[model samples]
Target: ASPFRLASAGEISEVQGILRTAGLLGPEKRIAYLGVLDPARGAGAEDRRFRVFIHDVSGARPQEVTVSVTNGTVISAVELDTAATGELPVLEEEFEVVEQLLATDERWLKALAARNLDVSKVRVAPLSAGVFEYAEERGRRILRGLAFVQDFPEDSAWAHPVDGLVAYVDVVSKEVTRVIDTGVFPVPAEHGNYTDPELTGPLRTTQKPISITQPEGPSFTVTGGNHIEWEKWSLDVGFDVREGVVLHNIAFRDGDRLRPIINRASIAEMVVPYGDPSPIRSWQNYFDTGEYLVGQYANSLELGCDCLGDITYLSPVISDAFGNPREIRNGICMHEEDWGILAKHSDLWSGINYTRRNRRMVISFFTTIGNYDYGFYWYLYLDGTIEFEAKATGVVFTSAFPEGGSDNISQLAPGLGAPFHQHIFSARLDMAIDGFTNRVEEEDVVRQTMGPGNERGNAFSRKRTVLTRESEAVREADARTGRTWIISNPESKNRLNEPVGYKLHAHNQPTLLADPGSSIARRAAFATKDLWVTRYADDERYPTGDFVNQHSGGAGLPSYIAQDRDIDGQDIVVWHTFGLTHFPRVEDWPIMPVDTVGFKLRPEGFFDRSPVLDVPAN
Candidate 1:
């Protein structure tokens, strides 16, 4: 009567045989039969469920099969659901077409098979384990079993590249199945294939909320303001008449690893406070001068003057605003020799200052280096103009904060505990242009204040002192702008302290219009949209806080600018963030395992227009 009850051990054996023949099993191993199949009777007539989990010698996410065991027929097979990550390496439609074409091409299959097959090199091996169990309930048979399936092993000659596809065959049926296809994860495609003009206009406005859930980690959501929505990532560009634009790049983290692979770069040009035969030459000289400044700071920390010891350094070589061809020594402390370099580069100041006076634009180029499997954001600013961009780079994974750490202090706070460890399922970006400007100024003051500490502290102590000084300076800046902003974590605070971490500060001063009515609420009112907002806040300590706290201390310029119009405008805002999850294991010495990262650029009201308007004719 039901499909589950009809499965037989012989049939399972047949299936196992087929799989083994198809290279799904080891040479000496056959598919192990767990039990009988279970059948569905009434309400679930069309659906039958069975499970078969497989494992290799090395334990990992196992392959499982949940099928309709009735009538000895298979219902469903449990495999690694890459789609669950919210991104598909291949488009479903495109994949279907490809599959169809391949199915009809016998020659193609033969050619592929004949090509010097080396399973060892590809790190491919059959999962040697399997089990099938069956039970009878109410005259219906229920089938449940587990099976072991190996990913393409590192030594398998057939192993594909990162996110490559792995194929397996059912022992009895000889039916080919995809065990895994490693590529970019797939997110929902709500924007349709057509691009919206509004999103790509000179000034485009859009907003959406971003939320993601990791397998066993924190979930988060971001609200407030318009957000650029995509299947995987979201970008928020904050723009204001007073401060210009600011960008916040946010993404989901599952444990300590990024779930996607993302790589990108940008170009930036800016005015330097120097005049010379060439800006590049002057900038180079200026960096030489600043080398001593940085050295002095590093020396105060009692760390060696080696650039490697200190994170701060000034390049003697001239390059772009974003430090292209960065040519400065590395060290955590400042030294006398570095000071001499600073003196030699003094011309940089006048040149940059002159450029700023003439409205010369400073451009910054950035790129992401990792296997990104989540969403991301990026921002661009041009004088008073701002633009925002977002994209979903890969799939989502489960993420959460550490249970104990300095972050625990906030969670343990009496009244603040409620929001602590609450599993943030959402994130919002509310940027006040005025607030960002004030923070930048304060950050400068903090940098100045730390000058004395660099001459007298250890590296650790010096860094801590710098952070404290920066925080105080940020507090002062907040006072000046009367705005308050929240950063997700403390690591972000450290990143904000770095000159090129995230927040960008242009030396030119903008014409400030005093707003006597300035208050936190009043300032926040100018926030237009939230970008890279997530659903949860992880308690994990970010080593550099660069992604979340680029300018959290009220520093840096806005990412985009818009006219008075709300959603229907020509201007668009864009912003982005790039990060890497570092898990330096013994195996990852000179060479390393592939790293992943991602981003999201979904549609918002501002970008409700078409994105395909600029496509050039082929």
Candidate 2:
């Protein structure tokens, strides 16, 4: 396959086990698990090979290595093109230092007592990815955790973030590095805000069981553990320790023809920059996906709660400290849902009524990165619409001030606010519509100027412009410009004589507020632009650099596009970076509600008529 598949857990473990005997697995050397590499050619009657990323930190200077393995046999291991500066992600057990410190470190105990929280009644846990974690900062591998005063013996500690305390522990030294005190004291024990639970009140029994059943059952079939085949849809799904779910070799069956859509699609990088100015909070711009590996923090979903209906839970694997494969089950979920009202048309006079119910195949995955939970979902509708979205849920980070309240800086919970932080997520979409080479054109619905065409200045028009050069391909979402990027295959057309293509729509788009020269801004330059179209290159995948934590800033799409490569009639990639500016509110107290955002890629004149016309209305 042109789109390389991910290495299996068995294959990954075998490679590490072999290297262990060969003196390669030790304190200084480890596997980083970059991802699977594409074969030189198409699949054949031959062994499958995958590239394993290895890092050597024992030597005076860190080095990067690549090992190729075939069916549990080591093919070859070679040194790298550049020095490996980024360290592997923080391990699961290693992130437990927040509790470890509370029990062992004297300083942490005193800080706890200062807040009047009983050491025996308070529990703590680490949050998501922190700022850049460079290898050079050995004594400073910081893990931030929230301390909560247990409301009751059985109450969930999650709802009780200790009024104004945060702990910073150094996992490397296995000790408490510091505690951030925002000067707020604990709420009165009788306040009743922190002891909330599922109730027996009026709405308590409002929970009703609803069921979705199809007499014929599911129409999709799972094959080979990673591939799924459905009517008009066929694709390979894989998971990574950093990027979560990855879709490969996606093709839509169009009548007698199978047309290629996207070669590979996944989220590349996500930046959540904090807005506070405190010593520990100021440098809190985290490259969640790139630096911290959000996939590593994937939540173990519960059936009938996290997901509903008939579910197919996908087991994911990641690299352990010794470069061994560790299975994390149910990190990703797949299901189908019956969406109401696909379309409806009714006429009273004609006595005609037509309707159809839309069913969507959804691939759902979630990452619980500390205070926030991120959920990514991909939906495929029978009518030829592809929707990729993300939802933000879970608790918000909070601290307290003596004067903390709603009047104290827009407090969500006493003293929780940002310096104006933003969560800007970038998704890399490699579109191979119909065939490989395609051209992008910007179509805008704009107001007309005072001209002969609109002498009354009361008309509007659609201005179409061809994107030929790379520089002309970068764009932003504008309400007045109201632009749509069309990936049109010039060689193909529909019955309407329009080019067969796919359209990209990025709604509710926001942007970075930091200055260009700031360190966080420089590192995440990709977040500066909303939409980018470039000539496809296999090696160029991430919007941020390969190892965003420590690598030099000039490595990702920003540098790739500097060449100004011609994108006209070329295999193109569309990079979408959208933002969410979260300002905490009182309604978001205790735990924050889920906020969903994303864009869609829909078929545009690719079919002569409705593809789902035959969908059973019954």
Best by TM-score: 2
Work out the TM-score per prediction: 0.19, 0.86
Candidate 1 residue lDDT tens string, 99-132: 3333333432443344332322222222211111
Q: Rate the local accuracy (lDDT) of all candidates.
A: 0.22, 0.71
Maximum-lDDT candidate: 2
Q: Worst 10-residue stretch by lDDT in candidate 1?
A: 416-425
List residue ranges in candidate 2 displaced over 4 A.
1-7, 27-34, 38-47, 51-63, 71-85, 98-203, 346-352, 401-409, 413-420, 455-458, 550-552
TM-score of 1: 0.19
533-557: candidate 2 lDDT, tens digit per residue: 8888767878886666544466787
